[PDB]
């Protein structure tokens, strides 16, 4: 019933156009994408064990044109395997086209395309920062509730070849074993406190020793030493996260033990940033593809 290849074809038709051309799918096609993606999310672990080669991407925030550029540089699926670290909606102008293409690719390739949950894949957040207004304007409130039910089943973290830990925000003072993540039940909202909250909200800070209060008002900050101790305890080599705008699209921390990815160029306006995508080959040999602002 779900004509996936026609949906993807219509979503990719605006490839080659000036940034801003809309794709207006039907309400039933979008609701079909959400429900089928939701059941695929629930059938897969909440802590994904992934394998290289794959390409990792950071925040998109409804910048659909730059998502298509990112796919042009790294190859549209299934030419390359993808892992997104969340924050697909809000702030941008085309959050609907962004999330619909990512959900469709998740359904078309359930074992080579993966999406993690960001703090904006939460009804308490995306109601305010743009996604709800975009759903209400172009569709209805009922479709927004359907997106929420789908967002509550997104996986929380991913581990690539038992060596690269991936989440949207960062570490948590309540994260002692990876089994704690695997036991989180879905569907679930994002709490104001606890492990699930910190994995989507926390940030690294250079001027903090240990754990400190995050000026976002939510979760905590962690220093370069918490990263090194966390990597040594679980025999990991790198933490891969997003959640923060960075000038070059990437930013190292704790001597290349943690990296921050951001894939939305010209995000702040008052601060010009580039977008980056992390490419990892079979030997865990990593590099960066940079998306220069248009």
């Amino acid at each position: 019933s779900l004509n996936l290849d026609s949906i993807i074809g219509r979503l990719l038709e605006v490839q080659g156009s000036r940034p801003g051309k809309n794709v207006q799918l039907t309400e039933n096609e979008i609701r079909g994408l959400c429900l089928k993606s939701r059941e695929i999310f629930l059938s897969q672990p909440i802590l994904l064990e992934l394998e290289a080669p794959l390409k990792i991407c950071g925040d998109i925030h409804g910048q659909y044109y730059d998502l298509l550029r990112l796919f042009e540089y790294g190859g549209f699926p299934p030419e390359s395997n993808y892992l997104f670290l969340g924050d697909y909606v809000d702030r941008g102008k085309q959050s609907l086209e962004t999330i619909c293409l990512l959900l469709a690719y998740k359904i078309k390739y359930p074992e080579n395309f993966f999406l993690l949950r960001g703090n904006h894949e939460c009804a308490s957040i995306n109601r305010i920062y743009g996604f709800y207004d975009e759903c209400k304007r172009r569709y209805n409130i009922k479709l927004w509730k359907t997106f929420t039910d789908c967002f509550n089943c997104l996986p929380i973290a991913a581990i690539v070849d038992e060596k690269i830990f991936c989440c949207h925000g960062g570490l948590s003072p309540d994260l002692q074993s990876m089994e704690q993540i695997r036991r989180i039940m879905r569907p679930t909202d994002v709490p104001d406190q606890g492990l699930l909250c910190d994995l989507l909200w926390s940030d690294p800070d250079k001027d903090v020793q240990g754990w400190g209060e995050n000026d976002r008002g939510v979760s905590f900050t962690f220093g370069a030493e918490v990263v090194a101790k966390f990597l040594h305890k679980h025999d990991l080599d790198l933490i891969c996260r997003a959640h923060q705008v960075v000038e070059d699209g990437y930013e190292f921390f704790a001597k290349r033990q943690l990296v921050t990815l951001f894939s939305a160029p010209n995000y702040c306006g008052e601060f010009d940033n580039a977008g980056a995508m992390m490419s990892v080959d079979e030997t865990l040999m990593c590099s960066f593809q940079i998306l220069k602002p248009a």
Binding site: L50, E51, Q244, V245, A254, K255, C286
Partner: peptide, 28 residues
């Protein structure tokens, strides 16, 4: 094939921008 179930190193063009004073923001 499939993705879902070594040491991490970086290529020569990859630079370490940690101590390069790169600006970062948490929101806007």
């Amino acid at each position: 094939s499939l993705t879902i179930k070594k040491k991490v190193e970086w290529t020569s063009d990859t630079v370490d921008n940690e101590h390069m004073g790169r600006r970062s923001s948490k929101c806007c």
